[PDB]
Design a protein around this ligand. Structure first.
Ligand code: HEM
Ligand code: HEM
Ligand code: HEM
Lengths: 158, 158, 158, 158, 158, 158, 158
């Protein structure tokens, strides 16, 4: 079914964001794992899988709407060198992605692509859950101190 | 444990190949799915998951050897427009990757990084399995004709 | 128990036929497998196992009758280069073997080696089953055409 | 995938060794069985099946590498007339095969056929297990005497 | 159904052989048991049951063919006084019985009593199995020595 | 099977390393246990069992190759007096052992003892896993502080 | 809890005996295994595990009593070259160890270290069981002869 060209461009742009998050969250995960921060590896890896699911949804949607998914262009990764920097970087990435999502959702509505909108709203809901987790972790680092925070990561939950 | 710098560069180069295959196989898969070629979507998607597993192994190994995994640089995808072109493109990608693997395996041996070698040999074994499948499919297209070939893809196995 | 010398020679000759069929059917099987003709690999391989069972029966019988099983001499294999040629070659091999079996069965009867005869009749029954399958497949190639025939081989049954 | 021609020749040569062992171990097995040496029939027969598995691996590998498996040429069998001679003959056969394997493994490495090498190393590992068993049995014959050795073979284990 | 008179006479003669074997094998069995040769008692007793089954088949067949089964005349038993003599005596008895069976099978064929023939061939097959076991045991006595042979009989298998 | 003399010497040298690790890891384990550091006792003890498995492999291999395993000479233990010193000492021991392994693996290859090589590569893979764990623990001590690190050891996982 | 210094020295001396037995029994076990003497490998290996358990008890006890377990000094192994010599050597080792145990048990009593005594009495009980087994085996060698003795070892029990 021929979709609206601009919806397709938004979908490719969102896909682009997901491709960046997939890689950044995957590397961050295995960095945590290497450091023995098991709990962080589990969450971060499952966050990477989640973005893969999102990418898959965009790819299928783009294809259905008869556009060309773009997996060739990869935006800037921002890989941190310590736990806090890594988490802040993920947070900034999510915030930028939410921004793009809000714009796309608004536009899809005004061209009546309600199923693209509906798919994007579920994704935004998942992203806000991830933003919440990131914000909470960053606050915990500050409230309990880094040493205690790190110790709390060495065993998986539960 | 500080690894050999050049082994790390090889590992990053191989990781690079996997990142390309992950994306190319994933797009190809969902293209097949869109076309209703269920059997091809299943194999191609599972081939994409397989390259993700390979990437994961390289990432962990690089990290253990104390290098920096590079997930920022993404080589050229070659996305085909019909089934045969897609499969040929995957085949050429695998052949180039096997070439790189053989070189890395040789070099790891001569610096005594036997566990990197051992990991790379398992990966090469998986790739040759994939090359075999690709070669066989391409020959089937020719032997049974495209119409029959396509019909044979519309139901998953078994 | 000292058997009739000539029965032993027949048994060794039949064993000879089985040794040829074992190898020819095994190679043919893995050729089909390589080509992705799964259904043909299954039947052909199980036909190879069957001839191994026959060889085993001859070997034990020869030994019981106090002769020397000959596994040293291997007759001519006729390995085909395409599906039809392979199947025709197996068919001609079975037909020649049935011929030898009929002679041996007749002779065993006239020297009263009724248990050798009885064993050979079961084997002839298995061979005629195999001849029937071969004849039927060859006719299918012709009736449905090679392209359809090949497509019908790519998935195992059932 | 077009393999190295010389690797293919080695593979055919090793296949040749397996074809000889398959037959020799099978006859030896049923000789032991005829003599009521149940334990020896079980081991020897399972050693024959093992060489069949090896042959199968060579055949598939040769085919994948696009060469012609040779099952037509059968080397010299050396069938013994008593238990010790049979076992010594198997031992000499294994030792010659290990020799050929070592050469092939070395050569495959230098042309970078690492998966052929890897397959051949698993096979060599199985052969050395068989050599160990043979050497041990032959020593037992000598240590306990032939009469005791034979008595120890009449019931299967365990 | 009125059978051929001469087939009936053969059947009565074979029945005669079975009656002798039943008794001889039964006595031999309980002699072995008395001597504590458990393994030999088990085989010999089950050989006695087997000949009873054969007798039963002849009796039913004779009756069906409307003749008179003769259980009144009992041929010569040859009871041995030591293990080897007992086994040799059983062997000679089986060999004489096989001789009679071969003649009867030939004759039944020429008068078209194919079901009598078919029954006699199954019996001959059982007898040749028994001959094989006897021949093997006698050879074991010689190969391992009597003392070892006897020791190997004192526990049942398995 | 007579092995290469120098391979045997390497195997005895590696065995020597294992004997030292077995004892050092065992004492370190029960020191941790005494201190109530349950988690460390579990890992360290299981690391001791692991080196026992390695020793067993060398012993069997040496014996098969017809050499004399040397369990008489015991190298220097380096037993630490606090957690960090103990772990650093294990780490230095593993690093020295990896060094010896790499040399032996290289040499086994050049004399074609591919199964000794293959066994040694599996062992090196286990050692690198242990090195990774040690490096990670030592970094955790530093990142979370000793007090937090110790507290994290008092309950077993999970 | 600060233990008596001399009890600690005894405990270290007994530990020393266990370290020797661990190694000697382990090598002897795998020698038996190499020779195909399965039954002897099982008992001897389980005897080695048993001495490891004893060593573990001494190590924990020494640590609890606040001494330094000594795993650095390894007494003389006496590795035999044939079955009888190996068993005699183990027997002499056990006898010397029982001697040391009796002295230590007496002394622990007179300084009121009743729990060290109680632990040592359980160990002495295990050693006397092992002495009994050794004495019995050595007598069997003599009573049945070496050839019969060896044959009785080739299958595990039961
Ligand atoms: C960039 C585009 C990618 C897409 C569209 C994608 C898609 C997917 C999907 C749909 C799954 C199944 C979810 C699940 O396992 O439950 C998956 C699994 C997985 N992915 Fe990705 N992926 C991508 C890239 C990557 C990369 C770069 C890595 C890094 C190594 C990776 C690592 C993994 C791993 C380890 C699994 C689990 C394997 C399994 O157990 O099945 N993926 N991916
Ligand atoms: C010469 C090339 C041969 C090849 C490549 C080959 C291959 C095989 C394979 C792959 C199996 C199945 C293994 C398993 O899963 O257990 C098998 C089974 C068997 N083979 Fe062969 N074989 C060969 C020759 C022979 C010969 C000459 C004999 C002698 C009679 C023989 C006797 C048997 C028997 C009795 C079985 C088991 C049948 C059953 O009960 O399933 N084979 N063979
Ligand atoms: C030095 C040469 C040694 C060798 C070759 C050796 C070998 C082995 C092997 C193969 C196992 C069984 C592994 C498994 O299947 O889990 C084992 C278990 C064990 N070892 Fe050792 N060992 C040695 C020394 C020691 C020492 C010095 C100690 C210290 C006390 C020790 C303590 C133990 C313990 C406690 C077990 C487990 C017992 C059980 O619960 O079954 N070992 N050993």
């Amino acid at each position: 079914m021929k979709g609206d060209t601009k919806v397709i461009n938004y979908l490719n742009k969102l896909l682009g964001n997901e491709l960046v998050a997939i890689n950044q969250y995957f590397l961050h995960a295995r960095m945590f794992k290497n450091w023995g921060l098991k709990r962080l590896n589990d969450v971060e890896y499952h966050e990477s899988i989640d973005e893969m699911k999102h990418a898959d949804r965009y790819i299928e949607r783009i294809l259905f709407l008869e556009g060309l998914p773009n997996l060739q262009d990869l935006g800037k990764l921002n890989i941190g060198e310590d736990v806090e920097e890594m988490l802040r970087s993920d947070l900034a990435l999510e915030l930028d992605g939410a921004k793009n999502l809000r714009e796309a959702i608004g536009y899809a509505d005004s061209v009546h692509d309600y199923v693209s909108r509906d798919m994007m709203i579920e994704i935004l809901r998942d992203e806000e859950g991830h933003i919440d987790w990131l914000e909470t972790e960053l606050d915990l680092i500050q409230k309990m101190g880094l040493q205690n925070y790190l110790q709390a990561q060495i065993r998986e939950e539960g």
